[PDB]
Design a binder for these strands. Structure first.
Lengths: 142, 117, 109, 103, 54
RNA sequence: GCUAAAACUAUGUGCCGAAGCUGCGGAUGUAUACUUUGUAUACGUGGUAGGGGAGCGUUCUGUAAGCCGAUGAAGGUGUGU
RNA sequence: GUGAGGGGAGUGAAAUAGAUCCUGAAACCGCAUGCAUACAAGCAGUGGGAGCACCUUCGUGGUGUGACUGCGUACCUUUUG
């Protein structure tokens, strides 16, 4: 038993705030997923959540390359017959950037109860202000 | 010389059921279903005794990588530097040190980058 | 020091009787007696007879006071069944099982 | 202080007063064994990392005894092929108590 | 139409989860003090301070 | 999800990666050496039809007019080994 | 209910030896205690592993339970499969 696993009670979650102006969506999402899962700590345990809280501001300024802004399609099916609905990146970023980040990160996060719990630690806001001043987040450049 | 089977057969079935205890529904109550459950459990144990080494090595590598990137190196570069420096400490001990003592792991990283350069 | 009463061989299904048993489990004797008196189930009469016998045992053989008595325990178990034959159409026969039950009730202060 | 030692093809991190289990050694019960091939010795801020080995380091320990681990059952079965096999196993071990550590 | 598999005891109990009985509404009638069923005549023919029989 | 790529061509250094190989401990078949013994050495030990070898347990007969048993037999139900 | 069925008293070495009466296994069905369980998708286990209750020589212990996690599509027969 000389190798030990992290104890959930002893885990400490630190708060950070990230600005999305001008960055590339996927290359930002990879780092966000890493920090949410806790791969950056020497106490990392696969079955325990050791990540950190990540706030995102200016989410509607996220950028994509090529023609993806027009040609990247988001789908969703209502279980009724013929119920397939479609949208694209520009409209979706104009209307609900939170959904953009949620999709990008949930795709890269594990699928299960632990994944659902881990994704709760991400807060995304379209504006430059966030309501979490009480938690005292620190600026993180990623 | 007529022979009755009851005692021996009952003993065998009882032993199988005793090994089966803790399973759900018919698996822990019915001999036919229970006997299949025990064999599959044995097969899974045979496969997992091998899988365990791989899983623990992967965990050690991940923890070492986290420590190395805190000290400013990647896992591969740190391993190469240690090999050049001729350090023969294994990954299990390196991961334990990384988790429990930051100063010593920092000294090891210093030695590794020194060997690299 | 619970006082026990057993009614063995009641001609009713244990599944049916256990409903009334659960209805009265764990309550005071007076309230349970009122419930049984004002219920319309067949199992209620048998359960009431068993409970009254238990209270009489507690009062007569153990010198206890009924006012402090509650239904401390109760349960129903299956008994021996009777086998019958029901004729069906086209000469086919089916097996009918008539079920019986045992009622156990314990009263304690 | 703590030290790193090699035994039975594996490495262990130990401190004084610790009890550990290693592969079956030939030493007699109650005897003392010394490891002179220490890889690393830490005492507070004094960190010695022997490249192959730290020079002068010595870890001394006493042999409490020998024993066997809990039984393990091996099962092999090939479905639809009429083949089956079983066997038991118990791995031997020697238990050691670390009595001294010197850099 | 008939089942392809035998149901589990757990599922049978889950179906029976709605089988519990309920108590009736019992009250004490002031006229005699005997427990009686609410809004019903007592077993002795008393109701709302009136006696039906003789 | 990815665009001086996380794509393609060429090149270098490192690393991950199997029940493959090495390390530690244990079992076993064959053949050698010690020219007794059971101790070392070398090789080997996936497997259907099928062939060869070695055992566990159950009822009954002799050994048994012996040995265990109401200070508790067989049988049933747990625990430890 | 002058029923059936029980409780006390008494007999007996023994009354869950009380008359479908030696022992009383399994399937199946009750009651009580401890842990888990109402945001999460599949042969129900297996390798890890937090917390809780009890016993503790309080130990790197023992007995129950198992949040979270990697792997993982029953058995026999017949078949190229």
């Amino acid at each position: 038993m000389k190798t030990l696993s992290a104890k959930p009670a002893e885990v400490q979650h630190d708060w950070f705030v990230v600005d999305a102006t001008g960055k590339t969506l996927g290359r930002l999402a990879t780092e966000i997923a890493r920090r949410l899962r806790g791969k950056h700590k020497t106490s990392y345990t696969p079955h325990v959540d050791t990540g950190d809280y990540i706030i995102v501001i200016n989410a509607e300024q996220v950028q994509v390359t090529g023609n993806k802004a027009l040609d990247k399609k988001y789908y969703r099916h209502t279980e009724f017959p013929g119920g397939l609905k479609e949208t694209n990146f520009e409209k979706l970023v104009a209307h609900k950037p939170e959904e953009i980040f949620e999709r990008a990160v949930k795709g890269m996060l594990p699928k299960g109860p632990l994944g659902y719990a881990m994704i709760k630690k991400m807060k995304v806001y379209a504006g430059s202000e966030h309501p979490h001043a009480a938690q005292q987040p620190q600026v993180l450049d990623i | 010389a007529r022979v009755k089977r009851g005692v021996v057969a009952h003993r065998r079935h009882k032993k199988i059921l005793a090994r089966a205890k803790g399973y759900y529904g018919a698996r822990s109550r019915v001999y036919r279903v229970a006997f299949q459950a025990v064999i599959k459990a044995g097969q899974y144990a045979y496969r997992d005794r091998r899988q365990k080494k791989r899983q623990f090595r992967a965990l050690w590598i991940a923890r070492i990588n986290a420590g190395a990137r805190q000290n400013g190196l990647s896992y591969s570069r740190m391993i190469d530097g240690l090999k050049k420096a001729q350090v023969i400490i294994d990954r299990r001990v390196l991961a334990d040190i990384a988790m429990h003592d930051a100063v010593a792991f920092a000294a090891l990283a210093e030695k590794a980058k020194g060997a690299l350069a | 020091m619970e006082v026990t009463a057993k009614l063995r061989g009641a001609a009713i299904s244990a599944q049916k009787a256990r409903l009334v048993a659960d209805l009265i489990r764990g309550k005071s004797v007076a309230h349970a007696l009122n419930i049984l008196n004002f219920s319309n189930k067949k199992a209620a009469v048998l359960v009431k007879k068993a409970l009254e016998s238990a209270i009489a045992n507690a009062e007569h053989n153990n010198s206890l006071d009924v006012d402090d008595l509650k239904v401390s325990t109760i349960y129903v178990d299956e008994g021996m069944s009777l086998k019958r034959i029901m004729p069906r159409a086209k000469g086919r026969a089916d097996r009918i099982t008539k079920r019986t039950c045992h009622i156990t009730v314990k009263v304690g202060v | 202080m703590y030290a790193v030692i090699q035994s039975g093809g594996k490495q262990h991190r130990v401190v004084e007063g610790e009890t550990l289990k290693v592969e079956l050694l030939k030493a007699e019960s109650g005897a003392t064994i010394t490891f002179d091939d220490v890889l690393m010795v830490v005492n507070g801020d004094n960190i010695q990392i022997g490249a192959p080995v730290v020079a002068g380091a010595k870890v001394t320990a006493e042999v409490i005894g020998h024993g066997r681990h809990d039984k393990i059952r091996i099962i092999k079965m090939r479905r639809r092929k009429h083949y089956r096999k079983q066997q038991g196993h118990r791995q031997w071990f020697t238990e050691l108590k670390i009595t001294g550590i010197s850099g | 139409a008939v089942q392809q598999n035998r149901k589990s005891r757990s599922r049978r109990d889950m179906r029976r989860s709605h089988d519990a009985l309920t108590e009736n509404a019992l009250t004490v009638d002031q006229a005699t003090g005997e427990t009686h069923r609410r809004h019903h005549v007592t077993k002795d023919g008393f109701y709302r301070g009136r006696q039906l029989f003789a």
